RNA sequence: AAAACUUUCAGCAACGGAUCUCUUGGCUCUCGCAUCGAUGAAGAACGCAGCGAAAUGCGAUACGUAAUGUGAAUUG
RNA sequence: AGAAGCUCAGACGAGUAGGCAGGCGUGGAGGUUUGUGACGAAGCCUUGGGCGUGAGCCUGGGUCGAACAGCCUCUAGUG
RNA sequence: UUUCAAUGGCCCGUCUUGAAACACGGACCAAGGAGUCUAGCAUCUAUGCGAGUGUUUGGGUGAAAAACCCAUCCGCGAAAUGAAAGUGAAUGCAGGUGGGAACGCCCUGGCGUGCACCAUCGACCGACCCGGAAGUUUGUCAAUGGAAGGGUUUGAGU
RNA sequence: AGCUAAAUAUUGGCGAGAGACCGAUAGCGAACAAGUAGAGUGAUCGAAAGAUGAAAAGAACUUUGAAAAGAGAGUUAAAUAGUACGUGAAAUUGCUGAAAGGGAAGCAUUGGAAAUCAGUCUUAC
């Protein structure tokens, strides 16, 4: 609120808290980001290094659509089936193997991150690193991709 | 409580609407109640003061004042009673007005329009 | 739940709270201090007991743990129109056994109120 | 003073659940209830439940 | 000018922007308004769906 | 759990009772309703 | 006239939670007895810690717990699991372990988990019953740092400590000061 | 019952809705002190307001 | 050095219009509506009542005529 | 034992700029107090009394004539 | 309360090293009169939930600008790194070591045990510098592809 | 080359309902005879100003005075409401009482003098 501010604490105080020598002025130091390479530069090297300059080649007309890639790494596999799902087929010997397709879970590549437990499993997705892949295989089950 | 939202609660408005009505929207406004044998005879908690009517006065300084009314004076919201007069220093006398609503109506002034207007308002004649 | 009470009446909005500036009174209808404070809080103190006056007669008044769903008959009122002797053996024996240190202070209550009722 | 003030404030939902079960909590507590305000020193029971 | 820790400022806010605030007080307003539309067509075009 | 008893409109008990609801077991916390009101009855302010 | 270096000197410390929970102040009202009146190091530090404050109460996990209970050596047994703070579930462990925690929150899911799967959940009031010196108790704590601020907290030249950048790109603190191509790297 | 629901249990009218859990399981915080198990090992109490 | 005079304090009386209470006003928000003019508009000027300067209203049919409604006033 | 309470002991006390804390006062909002009021509310005057380190608060008498306040919270065009 | 006597007491505010100042402003009284709001940011604190979180763009529902309820999206977070192309996080109980909260055992210590946090030595991921094993087909001699392995380089990582 | 409803905007106009808004130096400049009075060749500039009482019942009459008025009386709940009108602060002013004073005054401290005043007590056991 108001109340249980100042300026209701320096009511009676002259100055207003910002001092009698140098006062409270406009914009002594200058308007905005004013400076950076002249009188700011302490600031702006010690606490904003690379702010000044450009790094790397321009993309006209960048989209974000066909780049959309999230990632999921293998220890999340198992917790994007239901739990039904994982209560049937986690650690129990079945003939029939599950499947999670992590492109409905809204992932674009799996990583891979963490273990995966012993149970085959079939991962239906886009992307796949090379390792995520070994240790899928190494847990018995396989990678399909999807497009 | 009022559920209309074409009908307004506000101070400001009511008391402009009173104080601003035209001379027919006060005829309303000044209204009083009739005595108990009329209303035991027409059916009617109310009606709207006409001159040459019988009324008594029922409060104020003057209550229990008797007379009848020779003229409802629209602008002030004050009703003149015959006898209901004041002895200025002068010698001369100027008249008490009341309000509508602090009379009862004991003989109302019949016409072919009052009686319409007491058999419109759920009554009879 | 008892201290969830008091959490929630004793140091804030209660309607038998009077606070002024620097203290606490308590005009609730079943204290004997008539100060605010668990140890003496109706509310909050499921087993307790209070005297107040009425018309000449005198009363105490008890609850228990046992009806405190039922607020039409979760106090229990008892009357005594004696002398003073006979009202304080009265509250002693009726507190003997219940409050703990609410003895004193009814006999206190009560000494107040006959002398109002003298008066 | 301008109109765009902040006039209208956020509570989450879950929150907003949460004191609403903590009032009805509330109201089932006599004591409470006394405190409050309210002469019911003479009702039967709380909650006081009547029939449709 | 520029002291204190966190982000730059990057307020853009060097125009006459209060001359074009645009405030949500008639959202409640307009909801019940396209209530009320969706209502009228409802009943205005007969057991046709409204969709 | 505890069961209430229902009253007619002549005041008189019931027979059929309803057991208390779990809501009546939720914590009771004076200090997030008063900050939840504080909020809520700021709700239908109109702007001066 | 005496030569003192600071007059009338507070430390730092809490006495009391800031926050106005009439529950949380109920239990530490329970533990200012219990810490006064036992020898108990465990009732001042749960004390203690239930002054502190949120930043100062990391959550902790269920895999967290199980990891820390399961230490080779441990001697973690049926030992109840003490932490004052958040209990909240990690869905990346699949089997839950038979445990026993007292915290002052258990989120819905890790306290379905551990009563589904083994153990037990319990408040501090209840581990105020079952081990009132907190005997045969392992006392546990969140990870004070891994909070967002300390991201940043003590950034600097060489310090390697991430700035405050409104976006993350090319564009943004990446060309001069932090790369030799542009001037400098610091 | 629908309203609210349960603590455990989801409620009918509010979508994933569970009543909100206490952080302390009894409230009753003296009759807890002043239990056997408390006062079995407290050491023996120190005075009250103490002589000078 | 007593009075006068000057200053202070109090009472009463002046000067002044603060304060308190009020409020047919303002401000802001929302809702609804779409209708100026060569068939002379917006605006301006001069007039018009038994007794009127202004405001309000009207145009030589001039504080208004007709028609409709109400139903007995207007009022210094 | 308004445990936010009670109690015991010791040391200590200057301060501009400045920081922090707890309080006093004002207008409006929610709750509350069987709250005060034409048998005199608010305001105002006072060589009356009382409280607080203080911001202030209460009261007797005079004037006056229509409303106003305590407490818990909300708020601000608040000294 | 008033007045007297004794002692003490310069005119306040202001910039200033320094104001009684022969430095500035102030004849007097009443009323008005200056760190506000908004979009962000950062620390801290409170509350809710927690690998999630955020109902209020809307729709539902209320005769009502409130409250209540709600589908699908979406924001932020759960992954980093590089200019990009791209690649993308367990040798180990998710390692050692030092100090460490709490606990246990023993006779004050000792012994275990070690959360949190720092010091430090590694391991892993991306860049950077080498190294080119498969494998893919197209140029098979090649074209493309990148494995193991090494640097003691680097990242706002695990 | 061309047309087109709805969803969208709306400091104006018109009709409504509101408000944690302002309360007569405020809120629109204007609550009132306000874009008025007044200013400027002109473009333009632009105020101040609400409150007797329930009712004028607005003070008949006698008396003094050239009159204005005063003094009685009268009206009223009240003229400590008389239109110079609710309440009526301060600056500042006159009267009265008290006091002080040899080229300032004010203040602080301590007590005297004079005026003024409360507590306490009287009782309870």
């Not at chain 2, 007379?67 to 602008?75: A, L």
């Not at chain 7, 533990?31 to 036992?38: G, W």
């Not at chain 8, 002043?34 to 002589?51: C, F, H, L, T, Y």
Request: hydrophobic residues 35%; aromatic residues 8%; proline residues 5%.
């Amino acid at each position: 609120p108001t109340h249980v501010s100042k300026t209701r604490k320096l009511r009676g105080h002259v100055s207003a808290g910002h001092g009698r020598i140098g006062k409270h002025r406009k914009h002594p130091g200058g308007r905005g980001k004013a400076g950076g390479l002249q009188h700011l530069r302490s600031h702006f090297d010690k606490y904003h290094p690379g702010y000044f300059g450009k790094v790397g080649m321009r993309r006209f007309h960048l989209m974000k659509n066909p780049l959309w890639r999230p990632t999921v790494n293998l220890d999340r596999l198992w917790t994007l089936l239901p739990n039904e799902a994982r209560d049937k087929y986690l650690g129990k010997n079945t003939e029939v193997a599950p499947v999670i397709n992590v492109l409905q879970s809204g992932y674009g590549k799996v990583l891979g991150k963490g273990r995966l437990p012993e149970t085959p499993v079939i991962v239906q997705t886009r992307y796949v690193s090379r390792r995520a892949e070994e240790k899928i295989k190494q847990a018995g089950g396989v990678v399909e991709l999807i497009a | 409580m009022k559920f209309s939202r074409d009908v307004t609660s506000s101070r400001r408005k009511q008391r402009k609407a009173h104080f601003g009505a035209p001379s027919s929207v006060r005829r309303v406004l000044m209204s009083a109640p009739l005595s108990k044998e009329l209303r035991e005879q027409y059916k009617i908690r109310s009606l709207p003061v006409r001159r040459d009517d019988q009324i008594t006065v029922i409060r104020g300084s003057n209550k229990g004042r008797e007379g009848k009314i020779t003229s409802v004076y629209r602008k002030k919201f004050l009703l003149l009673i015959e006898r209901v007069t004041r002895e200025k220093a002068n010698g001369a006398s100027a008249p008490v007005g009341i309000d509508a609503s602090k009379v009862v109506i004991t003989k109302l002034h019949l016409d072919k329009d009052r009686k319409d207007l007491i058999v419109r308002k759920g009554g009879k004649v | 739940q008892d201290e969830v009470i008091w959490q929630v009446v004793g140091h804030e909005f209660c309607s038998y709270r009077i606070k002024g500036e620097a203290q606490n009174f308590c005009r609730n209808e079943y204290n004997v201090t008539g100060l605010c404070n668990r140890q003496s809080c109706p509310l909050a103190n499921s087993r307790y007991a209070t005297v107040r006056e009425d018309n000449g007669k005198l009363y105490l008044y008890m609850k228990t743990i046992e009806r405190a769903h039922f607020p039409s008959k979760l106090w229990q009122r008892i009357k005594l129109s004696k002398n003073y002797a006979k009202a304080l053996e009265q509250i002693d024996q009726q507190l003997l056994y219940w409050p703990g240190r609410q003895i004193h202070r009814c006999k206190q209550r009560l000494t107040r109120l006959t002398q109002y009722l003298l008066k | 003073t301008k109109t765009w003030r902040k006039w209208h404030v956020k509570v989450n939902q879950n929150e907003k659940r949460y004191a609403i079960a903590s009032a009805v909590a509330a109201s089932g507590v006599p004591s409470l209830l006394l405190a409050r305000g309210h002469r019911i020193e003479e009702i039967p029971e709380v909650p006081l439940v009547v029939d449709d | 000018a520029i002291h204190v820790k966190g982000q730059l400022p990057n307020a853009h806010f060097h125009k006459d922007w209060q001359r074009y605030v645009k405030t949500w007080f008639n959202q409640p307003g307009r909801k019940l308004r396209r209530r009320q539309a969706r209502q009228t067509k409802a009943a205005k075009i007969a057991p046709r769906p409204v969709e | 759990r505890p069961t209430v008893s229902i009253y007619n409109k002549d005041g008189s008990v019931s027979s059929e009772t309803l057991a208390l609801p779990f809501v009546f077991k939720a914590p009771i916390r004076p200090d997030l309703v008063r900050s939840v009101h504080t909020a809520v009855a700021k709700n239908k302010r109109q702007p001066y | 006239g005496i030569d003192i270096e600071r007059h009338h000197v507070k430390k730092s410390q809490r006495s009391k939670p800031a926050s106005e929970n009439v529950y949380l102040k109920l239990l530490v009202k329970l533990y200012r007895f219990l810490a006064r009146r036992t020898d108990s190091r465990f009732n001042k530090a749960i004390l203690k810690r239930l002054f502190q404050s949120k930043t100062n109460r990391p959550p902790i996990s269920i895999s967290k717990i199980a990891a820390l209970t399961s230490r080779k050596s441990a001697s973690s047994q049926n030992k109840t699991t003490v932490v004052v703070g958040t209990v909240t579930d990690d869905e990346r462990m699949l089997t839950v372990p038979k445990l026993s925690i007292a915290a002052l929150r258990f989120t819905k899911s890790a306290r379905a988990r551990i009563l589904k799967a083994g153990g037990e959940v319990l408040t501090l009031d209840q581990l105020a019953l079952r081990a009132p010196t907190g005997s045969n108790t392992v006392l546990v704590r969140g990870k004070k740092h891994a909070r967002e601020a300390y991201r940043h907290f003590g950034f600097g030249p060489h310090k390697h400590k991430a700035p405050y950048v409104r976006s993350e790109g090319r564009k943004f603190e990446r060309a001069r000061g932090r790369r030799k191509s542009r001037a400098f790297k610091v | 019952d629908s309203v609210f629901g349960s603590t455990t249990e989801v409620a009918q009218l509010k979508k994933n809705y569970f009543l909100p859990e206490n952080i302390i399981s009894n409230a009753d915080v003296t009759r807890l002190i002043n239990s056997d198990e408390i006062q079995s090992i407290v050491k023996a109490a120190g005075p009250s307001r103490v002589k000078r």
